[PDB]
Design a protein around this ligand. Structure first.
Ligand SMILES: CCCCS(=O)(=O)Nc1ccc2c3c(cccc13)C(=O)N2CC
Length: 131
């Protein structure tokens, strides 16, 4: 009962080599504190790279989720100074959580994992430094 699975999209872009560099205290906090905390969490592992929805057989994932996002992407974006400001990075974290909550049933393990990361995220974002 084989069906066409299609392809995963290319991973989100993580490099903008000709963007001028600008560090901000908020971007520094996101990289060195927020991302580090979530990355090392026991439930981070499914979120550390783009979801392979094809190989995991997640039906209709790319029809439902218009903007895939993951912490591996966010990490590389931060490291490469891809983000112009901290709100762009926070938007990506939110997109990652939103996608998981939209696609999956509320009881599911992956949702519980995302919720644990989001609770920690919001704790750290509460102490985001002023601009
Ligand atoms: C419950 C932990 C399952 C981790 S997994 O590697 O076996 N499968 C999944 C990885 C990433 C995602 C999902 C999702 C739904 C169902 C299974 C999995 C999903 O939304 N993601 C992206 C976080």
């Amino acid at each position: 009962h084989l069906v066409p699975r299609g392809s995963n999209p290319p991973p989100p872009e993580t490099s903008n080599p000709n963007k001028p560099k600008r560090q901000t205290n908020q971007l520094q906090y996101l990289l060195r504190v927020v991302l580090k905390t979530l990355w090392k969490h026991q439930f981070a592992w499914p979120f550390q790279q783009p979801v392979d929805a094809v190989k995991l057989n997640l039906p209709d994932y790319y029809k439902i989720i218009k903007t895939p996002m993951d912490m591996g992407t966010i990490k590389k974006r931060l490291e490469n100074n891809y983000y112009w400001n901290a709100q762009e990075c926070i938007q990506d974290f939110n997109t990652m959580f939103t996608n998981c909550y939209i696609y999956n049933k509320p009881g599911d393990d992956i949702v519980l994992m995302a919720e644990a990361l989001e609770k920690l995220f919001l704790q750290k974002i509460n102490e985001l430094p002023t601009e």
